[PDB]
Write a protein that binds this ligand. Structure first.
Ligand SMILES: Nc1nc2c(ncn2[C@@H]2O[C@@H]3COP(=O)(O)O[C@H]4[C@@H](O)[C@H](n5cnc6c(N)ncnc65)O[C@@H]4COP(=O)(O)O[C@H]3[C@H]2O)c(=O)[nH]1
Lengths: 175, 175
């Protein structure tokens, strides 16, 4: 399944690079080192494959707050390729605010684009199926990785949970 | 074929973002705005799927010279994700000196790591087959894209051609 390649590539090409470094990148963040309590990356996976470039456009309670210190890695001929995470602020009631290291699995944007291309390499139904398999395979990879296990949460978001991202994140935080 | 996903993803997730911006990013570069004469990106594809992080380790004539002006693009929740190309100096026996925007198709590193993993979802022999299909599919995709067609070159490199990277680049430049 094409989902298998996307899951393995998100692991080897991103999570395996950034997750073993995650606590150190947080410790270097003067703004966020003490505002992020659980040192974990939250990865949104939309079942619809609808990735939002600004997560506040999906749920306005989830607003971009800042960058973590970027990783700089020599990779594929690029000296000091920049790997950058985002911190989002979540406020559900007026009583508590939360700061999450948060992003979409952005390679899924290519699955969306594939299903729209003129030659139709992927139907919309096939795309939905592959997102399900992507979640399953990525979780299986992470569960077997000693360097990455426990440092990230895969968060599937259904189409009718678009405006509920804040609720889901705060619930998981309070597990 | 898993190679189809890698080809579509390298196109939609990278080339379609950076190639329309490449001319402006070359023009903004203080070091290379005049040294890069043809405004295009050369993509190395190793048939072995073995990517060198320093291309000079394969062909000593091809040395890292600097960064191009990086693109900043909001992407999947990341504000101003950084997309950076690399410029390589190529020095031949004629004493002629060239500067190329050059990189590996870096998602192929994941395909290599897949073939080596304890739970390898593909064999080393299937990896070879998949790199061939990646080249073919990426060519077909780029074939049909007006904004990207003239702005990049796919450069397959076999194991016994590692030390001939400079020859191929300079030959294509003089096509
Ligand atoms: N939040 C975040 N995610 C990243 C970053 N870099 C990669 N990722 C994610 O891992 C996927 C695979 O990365 P790859 O490096 O192994 O292949 C990359 C790589 O081959 C190329 N590419 C993307 N950004 C690049 C860049 N800045 N430089 C060189 N190549 C780049 O496009 C491919 C797919 O990009 P993508 O955004 O769709 O998917 C990424 C992306 O979801 C990053 O810096 N920040």
């Amino acid at each position: 399944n094409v989902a298998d390649g996307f899951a393995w590539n998100y692991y080897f090409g991103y999570l395996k690079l950034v997750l073993p470094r995650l606590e150190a990148q947080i410790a270097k963040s003067s703004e966020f080192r003490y505002k992020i309590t659980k040192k974990k990356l939250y990865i949104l996976v939309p079942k619809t494959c609808y990735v939002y470039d600004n997560i506040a456009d999906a749920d306005p309670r989830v607003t971009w707050a800042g960058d973590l210190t970027p990783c700089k890695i020599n990779r594929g001929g690029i000296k000091e390729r920049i790997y950058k995470q985002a911190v989002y602020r979540v406020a559900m009631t007026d009583k508590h605010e939360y700061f999450f290291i948060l992003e979409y699995a952005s390679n899924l944007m290519s699955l969306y684009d594939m299903s729209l291309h003129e030659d139709a390499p992927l139907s919309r139904q096939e795309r939905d199926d592959q997102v399900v398999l992507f979640i399953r395979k990525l979780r299986e990879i992470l569960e077997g990785c000693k360097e990455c296990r426990g440092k990230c949460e895969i968060v599937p978001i259904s189409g009718d949970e678009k405006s509920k991202i804040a609720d889901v994140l705060v619930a998981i935080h309070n597990a």
